[PDB]
Design an enzyme around this catalytic site. Structure first.
Site, PDB file in Angstrom:
ATOM      1  N   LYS A   1       6.027   1.930   8.372  1.00  0.00           N
ATOM      2  CA  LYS A   1       5.436   1.596   9.875  1.00  0.00           C
ATOM      3  C   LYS A   1       4.475   2.439  10.379  1.00  0.00           C
ATOM      4  O   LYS A   1       4.242   4.093  10.305  1.00  0.00           O
ATOM      5  CB  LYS A   1       7.321   1.416  10.809  1.00  0.00           C
ATOM      6  N   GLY A   2       3.908   1.244  10.933  1.00  0.00           N
ATOM      7  CA  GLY A   2       2.970   1.832  11.783  1.00  0.00           C
ATOM      8  C   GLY A   2       2.476   1.160  12.970  1.00  0.00           C
ATOM      9  O   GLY A   2       3.290   1.070  13.510  1.00  0.00           O
TER      10      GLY A   2
ATOM     11  N   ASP B   1      -9.698   5.497   4.219  1.00  0.00           N
ATOM     12  CA  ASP B   1      -8.318   6.626   4.148  1.00  0.00           C
ATOM     13  C   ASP B   1      -7.706   6.820   3.392  1.00  0.00           C
ATOM     14  O   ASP B   1      -7.091   7.152   2.582  1.00  0.00           O
ATOM     15  CB  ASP B   1      -7.708   4.878   5.402  1.00  0.00           C
ATOM     16  CG  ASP B   1      -6.644   5.897   5.676  1.00  0.00           C
ATOM     17  OD1 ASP B   1      -6.609   6.512   6.348  1.00  0.00           O
ATOM     18  OD2 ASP B   1      -5.808   5.077   6.225  1.00  0.00           O
TER      19      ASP B   1
ATOM     20  N   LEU C   1      10.203  -0.346   4.506  1.00  0.00           N
ATOM     21  CA  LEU C   1       9.522   0.887   3.269  1.00  0.00           C
ATOM     22  C   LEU C   1       8.693   1.653   4.481  1.00  0.00           C
ATOM     23  O   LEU C   1       8.235   2.985   4.265  1.00  0.00           O
ATOM     24  CB  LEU C   1       8.034  -0.020   2.299  1.00  0.00           C
ATOM     25  CG  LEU C   1       9.966  -0.776   1.135  1.00  0.00           C
ATOM     26  CD1 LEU C   1       8.884  -0.723   0.189  1.00  0.00           C
ATOM     27  CD2 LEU C   1      11.028  -0.104   0.900  1.00  0.00           C
TER      28      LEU C   1
HETATM   29  C1  LIG Z   1      -0.938   1.546   7.881  1.00  0.00           C
HETATM   30  C2  LIG Z   1       0.672   1.901   8.378  1.00  0.00           C
HETATM   31  S1  LIG Z   1       1.228   0.781   7.045  1.00  0.00           S
HETATM   32  O1  LIG Z   1       2.253   0.272   7.870  1.00  0.00           O
HETATM   33  O2  LIG Z   1       0.952  -0.457   7.163  1.00  0.00           O
HETATM   34  N1  LIG Z   1       1.423   1.696   5.950  1.00  0.00           N
HETATM   35  C3  LIG Z   1       1.805   2.894   5.022  1.00  0.00           C
HETATM   36  C4  LIG Z   1       1.554   2.439   3.963  1.00  0.00           C
HETATM   37  C5  LIG Z   1       0.806   3.189   3.088  1.00  0.00           C
HETATM   38  C6  LIG Z   1       0.268   2.968   1.920  1.00  0.00           C
HETATM   39  N2  LIG Z   1      -0.006   2.413   0.853  1.00  0.00           N
HETATM   40  N3  LIG Z   1       2.789   1.824   3.324  1.00  0.00           N
HETATM   41  C7  LIG Z   1       3.192   1.300   1.234  1.00  0.00           C
HETATM   42  C8  LIG Z   1       4.507   1.314   1.247  1.00  0.00           C
HETATM   43  C9  LIG Z   1       4.953   1.321   0.098  1.00  0.00           C
HETATM   44  N4  LIG Z   1       6.069   1.364  -0.159  1.00  0.00           N
HETATM   45  C10 LIG Z   1       6.937   0.922  -1.227  1.00  0.00           C
HETATM   46  N5  LIG Z   1       7.719   1.529  -2.590  1.00  0.00           N
HETATM   47  C11 LIG Z   1       8.443   2.321  -2.008  1.00  0.00           C
HETATM   48  C12 LIG Z   1      10.171   2.825  -2.154  1.00  0.00           C
HETATM   49  C13 LIG Z   1      10.839   3.494  -1.951  1.00  0.00           C
HETATM   50  C14 LIG Z   1      10.410   4.013  -0.825  1.00  0.00           C
HETATM   51  C15 LIG Z   1      11.464   4.966  -0.108  1.00  0.00           C
HETATM   52  O3  LIG Z   1      12.118   5.999  -0.568  1.00  0.00           O
HETATM   53  O4  LIG Z   1      11.553   5.297   1.512  1.00  0.00           O
HETATM   54  C16 LIG Z   1      11.249   6.682   1.631  1.00  0.00           C
HETATM   55  C17 LIG Z   1      10.808   6.826   3.297  1.00  0.00           C
HETATM   56  C18 LIG Z   1       9.574   6.273   1.149  1.00  0.00           C
HETATM   57  C19 LIG Z   1      12.172   8.068   1.446  1.00  0.00           C
HETATM   58  C20 LIG Z   1       9.181   3.719   0.031  1.00  0.00           C
HETATM   59  C21 LIG Z   1       8.713   3.614   0.082  1.00  0.00           C
HETATM   60  N6  LIG Z   1       5.879  -0.165  -2.286  1.00  0.00           N
HETATM   61  C22 LIG Z   1       4.725  -0.856  -1.424  1.00  0.00           C
HETATM   62  N7  LIG Z   1       3.888  -1.351  -2.272  1.00  0.00           N
HETATM   63  C23 LIG Z   1       3.058  -1.990  -0.963  1.00  0.00           C
HETATM   64  C24 LIG Z   1       2.835  -1.112  -0.314  1.00  0.00           C
HETATM   65  C25 LIG Z   1       4.103  -0.156  -0.429  1.00  0.00           C
HETATM   66  C26 LIG Z   1       5.226   2.256   2.312  1.00  0.00           C
HETATM   67  N8  LIG Z   1       3.976   2.328   4.024  1.00  0.00           N
HETATM   68  C27 LIG Z   1       1.267   0.848   3.842  1.00  0.00           C
END
Ligand SMILES: CCS(=O)(=O)N1CC(CC#N)(n2cc(-c3nc(Nc4ccc(C(=O)OC(C)(C)C)cc4)nc4[nH]ccc34)cn2)C1
Length: 276
Positions: A12-13, A125, A10
């Site tokens: 990447k950092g 942040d 979901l």
């Molecule tokens: C320091 C770098 S990091 O890596 O540590 N980092 C980035 C961070 C920022 C914050 N907060 N992040 C949290 C989530 C996240 N996503 C979700 N659901 C979804 C559902 C659908 C999708 C999707 O459609 O894909 C696209 C690319 C968005 C279209 C993506 C995510 N559920 C979560 N529960 C807890 C976290 C979390 C993703 N990135 C935490």
């Protein structure tokens, strides 16, 4: 929490990574899907920092804060939010999101930060990238990797410079007032609808001049902020709410508004423009 099937990544950092997994306890393939965050370079220094972060998230219980699930190199298991980040959601539903809906998201980001202050926590942040969307009516603060517990003996001296307060750029000092500054930036984004052309970094670079790089950008961002240079009012953004941005962007830390006062202002404005 039992060692989980890595479905898809979901977020990447550099030092972090969030993937979507499935518990499947009874191996019935029906266990609820959760969000797992692991470190990229699992060092000794990061492991210590990542350990605190897990303790901070498990200590937070709020409607607008992602609910921690537990632990599993350690792994942080959290609530999965299907709509992802707010900037991904807003960009895909701009035409279907008015100012009132915009102020709903603003109001519950405010109260989550208010609750955050109660525990003496400094997020450090606050940006739309760290705001997740559960359903179309509720967003949550999704990351706390930079959060620092305020010490027992009011600021924490420790990067997203275009969200930082001037005292954090110069003295590296972070406080509730520095979170208030960044919130105003978050409010700015919210009303530009995550337009990259009007993003804070794109806007600050045009005001500074993009014949600058490295840490000389930080030099000129400081001089611009100290000379009452601010992000412009986004088009369509009402005057009353733009003033909330400017009030958060005060150089004098003592005169920045509180999060409790911002939540009441946001709610009052949202109801006032809803009832005429
Ligand atoms: C320091 C770098 S990091 O890596 O540590 N980092 C980035 C961070 C920022 C914050 N907060 N992040 C949290 C989530 C996240 N996503 C979700 N659901 C979804 C559902 C659908 C999708 C999707 O459609 O894909 C696209 C690319 C968005 C279209 C993506 C995510 N559920 C979560 N529960 C807890 C976290 C979390 C993703 N990135 C935490």
């Amino acid at each position: 929490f039992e060692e989980l099937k890595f479905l898809q990544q979901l977020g990447k950092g550099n030092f972090g990574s969030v993937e979507m997994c499935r518990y499947d306890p009874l191996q019935d393939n029906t266990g609820e899907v959760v969000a797992v965050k692991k470190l990229q370079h699992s060092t000794e220094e990061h492991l210590r920092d990542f350990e605190r972060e897990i303790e901070i998230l498990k200590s937070l219980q709020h409607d607008n804060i992602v609910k921690y699930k537990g632990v599993c190199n350690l792994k942080l298991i959290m609530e999965y939010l299907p709509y992802g980040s707010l900037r991904d959601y807003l960009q895909k539903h701009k035409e279907r999101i008015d100012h009132i809906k915009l102020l709903q998201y603003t109001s519950q980001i405010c109260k989550g930060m208010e609750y955050l202050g109660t525990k003496r926590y400094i997020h450090r942040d606050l940006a739309t990238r760290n705001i997740l969307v559960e359903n179309e009516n509720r967003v949550k603060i999704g990351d706390f990797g930079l959060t620092k517990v305020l010490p027992q003996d009011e600021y924490y001296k420790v990067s997203p410079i275009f969200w930082y307060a001037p005292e954090s750029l110069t003295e590296s000092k972070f406080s509730v007032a520095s979170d208030v500054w960044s919130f105003g930036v978050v409010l700015y984004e919210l009303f530009t609808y995550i337009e990259k052309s009007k993003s804070p970094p794109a806007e600050f670079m045009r005001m500074i001049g993009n014949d600058k790089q490295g840490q000389m950008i930080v030099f000129h961002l400081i001089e611009l902020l100290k000379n009452n240079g601010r992000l412009p009012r986004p088009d369509g953004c009402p005057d009353e709410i733009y003033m909330i941005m400017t009030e958060c962007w005060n150089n004098n830390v003592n005169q920045r508004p509180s999060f409790r006062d911002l939540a009441l202002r946001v709610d009052q404005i949202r109801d006032n423009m809803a009832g005429g």
